């Protein structure tokens, strides 16, 4: 068996190269059936029930989705029996880079920003049409190939939307990446509505315009104060939508902050881009633009075509890992001989 930097994927996959790490490690490899290099991630989740959760979610959702702007699973490798199954290998198309790596060193043209945003929202339209929330959209979860085709990846924190149960108290702990969290997560939201993903896309759009995160909070409440430092103080109407007193009185305790105009923050940006940015980065999640409205926005008019923006055929844990291991074993059976 080949070893990189204990990789067990043969004999279909050979000539492995390290790519990176972070629930395991990712390599590229030659696929001797399809005669092309692919990406393989090795996952070792079965001890920690948390790992088994994220792994099962990603596998289940990505095997059910089929969309040009969502990464597919080509193959899954694992032992023939549960007893012998310690690692799972996920095989995907090899993608040249991701948007995080790209924004570290490349300035994007406006034409690239517009194309990337279109593809992000086209993929998100399909996700949301399945009643799924991605819940961790950020640059490193947007893969890009050599021709800038964009595919959303990593559904390990994804959930079925549940708006009726979205309310919670002030300073409720949250897992998804801090810089891309909508302001209501810190105030009164569990992140169970589609508007959580639109906020994240707004943050991605801002970052494409300047190559720097727009709201780089250094800790939990600091995130909210970066957001308010640009958006300014919420209106009386938007406060009145927050019924929870601890959250509301926190906001009322802050000094008045004026809005920072988007065209002062991004003086080179296309004005239509900044109009759509404003609508994605709206404080009140009920007033925030939805995915299909964003696709119809004038910034995207070169690409918008609802007939070519498909939706899903149908919509979409306390569990002891023994049942989760078993669930993972079952979900991955279709790739065995």
Binding range to ligand E9W, per CB under 6 A, among 85-93, 111-119, 221-229, 290-298: 85-93
Cβ-Cβ contacts under 8 Å for 297 (sequence gap 6 or more): 272, 275, 276, 279, 289
CB closer to ligand E9W out of 172 and 177: 177
Cβ-based nearer residue to ligand E9W, 130 or 142: 142
Calpha distance 243→169 (Å, rounded): 10
Beta carbon of residue 31, minimum distance to ligand E9W (angstroms, whole number)? 12
Q: Choose, by CB under 6 A, the member of 31, 75, 154, 309 that binds ligand E9W.
A: 154
Instruction: Considering the candidates 31, 98, 136, 154, report the single residue annotated as catalytic.
Output: 136
- Judged by beta carbon, residue 75 or residue 197, the one nearer ligand E9W is 75
Q: Taking CB under 6 A as the criterion, which residues in 119-148 touch ligand E9W? A: 143
Coil, strand or helix at 236: helix
Give how many residues touch ligand E9W by CB under 6 A.
Answer: 17
Give the residue ranges of DSSP H helices in 192-320.
Answer: 195-210, 220-231, 236-240, 245-252, 262-265, 271-280, 291-295
Q: In angstroms, give the least distance from the CB of 261 to ligand E9W.
A: 34
- Determine if 22 is a binding residue for ligand E9W (CB under 6 A): yes
Residues 198-257 that bind ligand E9W (CB under 6 A): none
How do the residues of the chain divide into helix, strand and coil, expressed in percent and rounded to 5?
40, 15, 45
Beta-bridged to residue 167, according to DSSP, are: 189
Is residue 40 close enough to count as binding ligand E9W by CB under 6 A?
yes
Q: In the 3-class helix/strand/coil scheme, how is 266-284 assigned residue by residue?
A: CCCCCHHHHHHHHHHCCCC
- Binding to ligand E9W by residue 61, rule CB under 6 A? no
Distances (CA, A) of 15 to 9, 29, 36, 182, 301: 11, 6, 11, 42, 44
Which listed residue (29, 41, 53, 194) binds ligand E9W by CB under 6 A?
41
CB neighbours of 198 closer than 8 A, spacing ≥ 6?
124, 280, 288, 289, 290, 291, 294
CA 222 to chain centroid, in Å, comes to 22
Query: Rule CB under 6 A: is residue 319 a binding residue for ligand E9W?
Result: no
Does 78 participate in binding ligand E9W (rule CB under 6 A)? no
Is residue 111 part of the annotated active site? The answer reads no
Instruction: Please tell me whether residue 5 binds ligand E9W under the rule CB under 6 A.
Output: no
Residue 26 binding ligand E9W, by CB under 6 A? yes
Smaller CB separation from ligand E9W, 70 or 269: 70
Q: Which residues are catalytic?
A: 136
By the criterion CB under 6 A, which residues form the site for ligand E9W? Answer: 19-20, 22, 26, 39-41, 90-95, 98, 143, 153-154
């Amino acid at each position: 068996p080949e070893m990189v930097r204990v990789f067990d994927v043969g004999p279909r996959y050979t000539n492995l190269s390290y790519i990176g790490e972070g629930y395991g490690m990712v390599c590229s490899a030659y696929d001797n059936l399809n005669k092309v290099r692919v990406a393989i991630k090795k996952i070792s989740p079965f001890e920690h029930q948390t790992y088994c959760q994220r792994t099962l979610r990603e596998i289940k959702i990505l095997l059910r989705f089929r969309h040009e702007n969502i990464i597919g699973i080509n193959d899954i490798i694992r032992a023939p029996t549960i007893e012998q199954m310690k690692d799972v290998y996920i095989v995907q198309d090899l993608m040249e880079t991701d948007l995080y790596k790209l924004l570290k060193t490349q300035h994007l043209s406006n034409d690239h920003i517009c194309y990337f945003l279109y593809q992000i929202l086209r993929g998100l339209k399909y996700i949301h049409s399945a009643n799924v929330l991605h819940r961790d959209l950020k640059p490193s979860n947007l893969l890009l190939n050599t021709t800038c085709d964009l595919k959303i990846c990593d559904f390990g924190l994804a959930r079925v939307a549940d708006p009726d149960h979205d309310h919670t108290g002030f300073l409720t702990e949250y897992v998804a990446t801090r810089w891309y969290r909508a302001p209501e997560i810190m105030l009164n939201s569990k992140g169970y509505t589609k508007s959580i993903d639109i906020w994240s896309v707004g943050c991605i759009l801002a970052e494409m315009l300047s190559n720097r995160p727009i709201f780089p909070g250094k800790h939990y409440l600091d995130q909210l104060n970066h957001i308010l430092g640009i958006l300014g103080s919420p209106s009386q109407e938007d406060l009145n939508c927050i019924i929870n007193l601890k959250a509301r009185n926190y906001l009322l305790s802050l000094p008045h902050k004026n809005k920072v105009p988007w065209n002062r923050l991004f003086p080179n940006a296309d004005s239509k881009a900044l109009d759509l940015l404003d609508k994605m980065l709206t404080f009140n999640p009920h007033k925030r633009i939805e995915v299909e409205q964003a696709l119809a926005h004038p910034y995207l008019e070169q690409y918008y075509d609802p007939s070519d923006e498909p939706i899903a055929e149908a919509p979409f844990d306390d569990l002891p890992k023994e049942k989760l291991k078993e669930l993972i074993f079952e979900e991955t059976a279709r790739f065995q001989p």
